[PDB]
Amino acid sequence: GDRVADVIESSIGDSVSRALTQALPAPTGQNTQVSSHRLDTGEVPALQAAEIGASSNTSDESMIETRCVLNSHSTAETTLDSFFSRAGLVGEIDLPLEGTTNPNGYANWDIDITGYAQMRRKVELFTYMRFDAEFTFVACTPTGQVVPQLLQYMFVPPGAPKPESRESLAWQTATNPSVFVKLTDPPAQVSVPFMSPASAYQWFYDGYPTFGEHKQEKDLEYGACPNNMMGTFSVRTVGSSKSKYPLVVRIYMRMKHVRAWIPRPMRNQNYLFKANPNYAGNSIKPTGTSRSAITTL
Amino acid sequence: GDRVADVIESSIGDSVSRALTQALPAPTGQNTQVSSHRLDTGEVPALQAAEIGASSNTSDESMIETRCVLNSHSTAETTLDSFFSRAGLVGEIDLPLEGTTNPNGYANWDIDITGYAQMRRKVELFTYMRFDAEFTFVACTPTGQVVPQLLQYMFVPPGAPKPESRESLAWQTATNPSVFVKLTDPPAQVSVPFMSPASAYQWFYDGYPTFGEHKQEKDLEYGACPNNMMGTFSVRTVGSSKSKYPLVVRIYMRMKHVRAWIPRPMRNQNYLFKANPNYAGNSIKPTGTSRSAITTL
Amino acid sequence: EIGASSNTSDESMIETRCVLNSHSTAETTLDSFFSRAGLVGEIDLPLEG
Amino acid sequence: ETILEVNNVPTNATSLMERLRFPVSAQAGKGELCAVFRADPGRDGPWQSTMLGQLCGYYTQWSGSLEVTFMFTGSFMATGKMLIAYTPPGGPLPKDR
Amino acid sequence: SDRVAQLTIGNSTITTQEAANIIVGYGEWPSYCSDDDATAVDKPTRPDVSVNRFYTLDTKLWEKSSKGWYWKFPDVLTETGVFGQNAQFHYLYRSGFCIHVQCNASKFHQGALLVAILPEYVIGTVAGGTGTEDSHPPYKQTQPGADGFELQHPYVLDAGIPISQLTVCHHQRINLRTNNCATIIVPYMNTLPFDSALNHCNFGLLVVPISPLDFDQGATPVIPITITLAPMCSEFAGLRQAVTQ
Amino acid sequence: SDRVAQLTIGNSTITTQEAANIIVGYGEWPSYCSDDDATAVDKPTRPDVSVNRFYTLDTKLWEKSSKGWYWKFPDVLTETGVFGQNAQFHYLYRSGFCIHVQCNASKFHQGALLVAILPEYVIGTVAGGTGTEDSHPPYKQTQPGADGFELQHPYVLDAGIPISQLTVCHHQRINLRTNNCATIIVPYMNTLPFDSALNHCNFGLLVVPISPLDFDQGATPVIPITITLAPMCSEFAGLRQAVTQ
Amino acid sequence: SIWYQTNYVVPIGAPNTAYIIALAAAQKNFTMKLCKDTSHILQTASIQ
Numbered sequence A, B: 001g002d003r004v005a006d007v008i009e010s011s012i013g014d015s016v017s018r019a020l021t022q023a024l025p026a027p028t029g030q031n032t033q034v035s036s037h038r039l040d041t042g043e044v045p046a047l048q049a050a051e052i053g054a055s056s057n058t059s060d061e062s063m064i065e066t067r068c069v070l071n072s073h074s075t076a077e078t079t080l081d082s083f084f085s086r087a088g089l090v091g092e093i094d095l096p097l098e099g100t101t102n103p104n105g106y107a108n109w110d111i112d113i114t115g116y117a118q119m120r121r122k123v124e125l126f127t128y129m130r131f132d133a134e135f136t137f138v139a140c141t142p143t144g145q146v147v148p149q150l151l152q153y154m155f156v157p158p159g160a161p162k163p164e165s166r167e168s169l170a171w172q173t174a175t176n177p178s179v180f181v182k183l184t185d186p187p188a189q190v191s192v193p194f195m196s197p198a199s200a201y202q203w204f205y206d207g208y209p210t211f212g213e214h215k216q217e218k219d220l221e222y223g224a225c226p227n228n229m230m231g232t233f234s235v236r237t238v239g240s241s242k243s244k245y246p247l248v249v250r251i252y253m254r255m256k257h258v259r260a261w262i263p264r265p266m267r268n269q270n271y272l273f274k275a276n277p278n279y280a281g282n283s284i285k286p287t288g289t290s291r292s293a294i295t296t297l
Numbered sequence C: 001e002i003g004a005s006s007n008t009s010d011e012s013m014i015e016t017r018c019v020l021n022s023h024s025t026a027e028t029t030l031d032s033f034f035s036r037a038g039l040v041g042e043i044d045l046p047l048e049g
Numbered sequence D: 001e002t003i004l005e006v007n008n009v010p011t012n013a014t015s016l017m018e019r020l021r022f023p024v025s026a027q028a029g030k031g032e033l034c035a036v037f038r039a040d041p042g043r044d045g046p047w048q049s050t051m052l053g054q055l056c057g058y059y060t061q062w063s064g065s066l067e068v069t070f071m072f073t074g075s076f077m078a079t080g081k082m083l084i085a086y087t088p089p090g091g092p093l094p095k096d097r
Numbered sequence E, F: 001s002d003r004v005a006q007l008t009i010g011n012s013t014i015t016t017q018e019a020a021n022i023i024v025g026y027g028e029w030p031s032y033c034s035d036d037d038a039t040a041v042d043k044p045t046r047p048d049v050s051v052n053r054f055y056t057l058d059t060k061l062w063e064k065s066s067k068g069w070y071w072k073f074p075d076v077l078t079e080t081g082v083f084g085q086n087a088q089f090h091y092l093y094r095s096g097f098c099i100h101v102q103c104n105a106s107k108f109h110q111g112a113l114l115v116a117i118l119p120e121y122v123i124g125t126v127a128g129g130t131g132t133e134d135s136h137p138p139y140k141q142t143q144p145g146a147d148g149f150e151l152q153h154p155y156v157l158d159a160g161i162p163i164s165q166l167t168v169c170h171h172q173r174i175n176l177r178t179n180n181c182a183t184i185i186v187p188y189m190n191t192l193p194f195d196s197a198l199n200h201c202n203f204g205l206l207v208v209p210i211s212p213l214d215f216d217q218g219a220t221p222v223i224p225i226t227i228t229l230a231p232m233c234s235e236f237a238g239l240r241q242a243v244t245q
Numbered sequence G: 001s002i003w004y005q006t007n008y009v010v011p012i013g014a015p016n017t018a019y020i021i022a023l024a025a026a027q028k029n030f031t032m033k034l035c036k037d038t039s040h041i042l043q044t045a046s047i048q
């Protein structure tokens, strides 16, 4: 029941996203047209204004004398599908016999793919990502030796009970997904869906997850997105007793059906911690290498 | 540009005043129909619920055995036109020769019609009133004697300069309206429009006119509507010298084209001040007279 | 006391907006809830004991 | 609808039936507090006593509206009025009505 | 199908099992201001659910020797919620109201309350008793907030006008044998389409026991009364800094 | 017909005589949330003029040895106006923004500023310098309000990412020979249709002098920079008591 | 949270105290996702 003119003539409730742009097919590189000399006034395609924040709309047809070039170079290798569907190391778990880390035949590894710099920097180019994945578990001895041993790879989502030992009752995998493998067999390989409560993962969360006063005590919460905590990956030696082969499981993740939003500046400083864009402020390095003089190369 | 359903299905901006009622013509009193005996169950027109806040919808056709009466009694004397178009005293100004009130041949009287109880209580039955008026000035001597004297009746609206004496330069009435009369002639009588900035006068203003802290110092502002302060009525003896006839001007106001909103309880206690519903709390009187016993008349 | 459950809504109890729910009921099926291999037995064939 | 046991105060054996109903006595009329409980089904609290709170343990993510039905188990001549408020997130424990 | 009611507006809901009916004040529903009637050119903000919802003020105890209480509108909601911040941040205001008064008691209690809406309930003074002093009421008593103020002389409503004729305004009666709620829906009443919420009060809400509460000891002696009220069709205009008074 | 602009939204108006143009962020205009994309069933309040209007935060002085400043959004407007009360009174929030940065100087001054919008500008620490400590930034520095916070290491934007590649986000450049304003229109950016204004910050606004300010003495040495920003297409949902942090 | 709006009123003879029974459910728009193994029930080993 709308009667006044201040609500009939309104734009409130306009859910349609008005865009200035339009994605057009670019299967090949842009071709070049033939260009001649211009000796005129008024039109100046070389003078720009970067103050507008836009980029140069210039060409080489407008700036030099060019020939017709038919470009048959494909733009198919710069897709996200090709750039990210390359299995990289995201984790590495050791099941030693003795020591300090995991001397009791089991190990839990909380999923963060931000422990090795090669795959981190490649995903931290973007702010939001939505992808399926394919994990692959390459288990072996420190020496690389392959051994006849049976393992159990359990996925423990959030809320589910983490196993406290090797003979714990969570390994029964009644509703949790698990995988059994021999190491004499090939590496395991499972495909995974997009499992977050949000429409995408996000490697940078500018804010705090919990309400309340924010003191120096619980300051470690800054940047923690629980929409990214997909849980825990556990691994044991299937048995009632101690094994005799030390083991190392390496995890290799490959994305599929990738979508990404909001590119960022790529990191030029060295990572130091996980899920934390900290740096060494004493040893700041330039993102390039130096000269001695600007006139001499 | 309305797209969501939470704004298409809305009633926001519905300016039409949805009323449950309808004014129908009632020129005469309601006629009576013939009624008989009823000896039935289910229908009980005498049992009501005043808890609903409504009034009894009963009849005498439903409660006694009645005859057909054709009522030819008119409802034309209870109109506001008839009830208020009766000229009553609203003010009384004295122009004595000596004394304390106005010994200098002029007198200003700020317009409030709430100085005599007979016309006040009759307008204070309502909360809002919008009317034209007709003022009438009956000037004479204390003894009632009529004398050959010329007067000037100036209306001084708000903002306009009040006259400080008889020979002041505001009496020149260049844009202000004035009236000259002899007292040997009939009473003056001018018609007046509805002159307020609001859509109606209001005899009760529940609030303060000025912003700011409200202390005991400026507590007299409570109830002051400046939408009712139509100004000042001034009167002098036209002359450069002192008169010799003492005078009393009486003002008699009559409404026309009356409209009124929101009836109120009529006052049962005595007025004490102007524009102020105060009472003597020690001598509270009932709005009726008493008995000695409820069983004996 | 009837033993039935509340037939109420949020359309009847608060002022709501049109929400088009595209959440699937396909994971609460018995097919999905039970087709998950779990341990039901464990047998030991020792040498002695 | 199954029983949401708000009065999860007792711990011993005999008073485990006290845990399914919370009391309503006469007060001084100053708008006091009767009871409070979180609206989180999978969290450890009153909802563990509900089928919703036990099936949601077998799942990791949930979405939708909830119902809470309160039934008065007092005399027919008893009468009263109560305010059952839902405080969305961010809201601390209210100190007053 | 009349003694039960569910008043749903916004994110709030009042259920009643012992209602009488709903009174609509002067036969008009609350509404928004037309373009014919408006004068201010600013576009008003119309927040539809954050301020149009039920608020709950405080409780008053109906004792034997209770005389009555009044609550001035919209002074009740100028320190309460998103309504009372917009009223501070804006200069103008326009809303109707749905008032709801609750008083529950047994079938062995008895009493009656008159719940009336009096527009422009200007307050008077006892003039020192003698009638000589042109005294004026304080700000504590004129606009007392949501804790209300009690009447000293409820026969004359502390203004010289009698309680008997107050049923010419809106009213319902809370008879503890018959009902425990009273719903009055009030439109906007003013000579002006808009006015300031902090200086002008549009009406007052009177709650007066005409019949005294009575019960035999053994029963519950504490019988509260709670005022519960919703703005309706609210509008705000004229935006500047926040001022309280 | 490009160097002049009048940005009118609400009861506010910014005139410019030395503009470049208006940047629309990622080619999307601010909008409201669809029924497909929404999940919360509550009806959101959409106040159209009381919060969609230009606010003016504070001034920063461009000196010779200035390094840069950042302002986190919507932390700038949580203690300011009718916007910052609804954000307190509600749990959710959704709005775009129109940022406007002013820096006026003569035709004998020179300098350049980069004015960039970086989403999810997470802040890093120097790790004690050595790189051994997993230190974390305080609340003063993460969310500093409308008085902003200055950068210590602006080459890496205090997050280990270089200033050079920041022109892949939204940006304009304030070249004192060419312009004195920079208008960026930002949509709502989140994985979620709604989020809380008090815990999550959607983006940061970086203001960095790439070229140092220079003038000969005799001129005016005080060159302020003022941030002026309007919410657009704002929406609120989930009403409870007001909480500040 | 549950607050006394008015009071719990009772006549002579009837009991001065009662009890309320809460009954929780869900609605037609409720959905669950990503099946796991429950955590708020554990088991002491050595069944039989």
Ligand SMILES: CCCCCCCCCCCCC/C=C\[C@H](O)[C@H](N)CO
Binding pocket: A111, A112, A113, A114, A133, A135, A153, A154, A155, A177, A178, A179, A190, A192, A195, A201, A202, A203, A228, A229, A230, A233, A275
């Ligand atoms: C049988 C074993 C299957 C194991 C399946 C593991 C599920 C993992 C899903 C991929 C999660 C994406 C990466 C997670 C988010 C981010 O790296 C961090 N949590 C946030 O910095």
Ligand SMILES: CCCCCCCCCCCCC/C=C\[C@H](O)[C@H](N)CO
Binding pocket: B111, B112, B113, B114, B133, B135, B153, B154, B155, B177, B178, B179, B190, B192, B195, B201, B202, B203, B228, B229, B230, B233, B275
């Ligand atoms: C030549 C002389 C003409 C005099 C005309 C006088 C104009 C008066 C217009 C009628 C005003 C209505 C009465 C005024 C309002 C109330 O009585 C009080 N001011 C408020 O209590």
